[PDB]
Amino acid sequence: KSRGNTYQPSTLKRKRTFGFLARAKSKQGSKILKRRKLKGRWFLSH
């Protein structure tokens, strides 16, 4: 069993979990977004 390939992309899943709207919808995600904005981040979410 060879490791290394732990990332296994699937756009839909990514958008569900790490997408902007998912962040927006949760309180915790909204707090994250705010924190990233404060930092100066160009890209707040996937």
Partner RNA sequence: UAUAUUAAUAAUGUUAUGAAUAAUUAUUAAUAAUAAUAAACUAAGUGAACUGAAACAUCUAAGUAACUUAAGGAUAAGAAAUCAACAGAGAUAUUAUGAGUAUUGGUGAGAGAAAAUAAUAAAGGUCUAAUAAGUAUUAUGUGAAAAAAAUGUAAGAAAAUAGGAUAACAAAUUCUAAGACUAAAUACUAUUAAUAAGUAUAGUAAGUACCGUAAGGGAA
Partner RNA sequence: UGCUGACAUGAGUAACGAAAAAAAGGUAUAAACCUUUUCACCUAAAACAUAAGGUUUAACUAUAAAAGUACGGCCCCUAAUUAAAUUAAAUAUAAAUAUAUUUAAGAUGGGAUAAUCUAUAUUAAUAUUUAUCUUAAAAUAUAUAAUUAUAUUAUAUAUUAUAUAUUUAUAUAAUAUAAACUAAUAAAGAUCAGGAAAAUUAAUGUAUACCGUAAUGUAGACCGACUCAGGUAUGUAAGUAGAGAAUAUGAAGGUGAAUUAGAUAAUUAAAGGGAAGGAACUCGGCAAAGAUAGCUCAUAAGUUAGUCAAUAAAGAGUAAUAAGAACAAAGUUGUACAACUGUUUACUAAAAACACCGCACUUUGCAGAAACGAUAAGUUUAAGUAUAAGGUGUGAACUCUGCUCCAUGCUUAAUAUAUAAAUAAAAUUAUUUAACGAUAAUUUAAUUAAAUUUAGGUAAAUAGCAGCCUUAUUAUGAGGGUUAUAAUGUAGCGAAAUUCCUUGGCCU
Partner RNA sequence: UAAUCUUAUACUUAAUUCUUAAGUAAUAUAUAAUAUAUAUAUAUAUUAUAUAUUAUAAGAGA
Partner RNA sequence: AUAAUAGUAAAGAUGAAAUAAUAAUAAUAAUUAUAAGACUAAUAUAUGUGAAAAUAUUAAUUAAAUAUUAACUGACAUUGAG
d(CA 6, CA 23) in angstroms, rounded, equals 23
**Side chain identity at residue 34, one-letter code:** K
d(CA 40, CA 37) in angstroms, rounded, equals 5
Answer yes or no whether residue 45 interacts with RNA by CB under 7 A. Answer: yes
Answer yes or no whether residue 35 interacts with RNA by CB under 7 A. Answer: yes
Judge contact between 20 and 34, C-beta under 8 A.
no
Answer yes or no whether residue 21 interacts with RNA by CB under 7 A. Answer: no
User: Least distance to RNA from the beta carbon of 19, Å?
Assistant: 10
Binding site for RNA (CB under 7 A): 1-12, 14, 17-18, 24-27, 30-32, 34-36, 38-43, 45-46
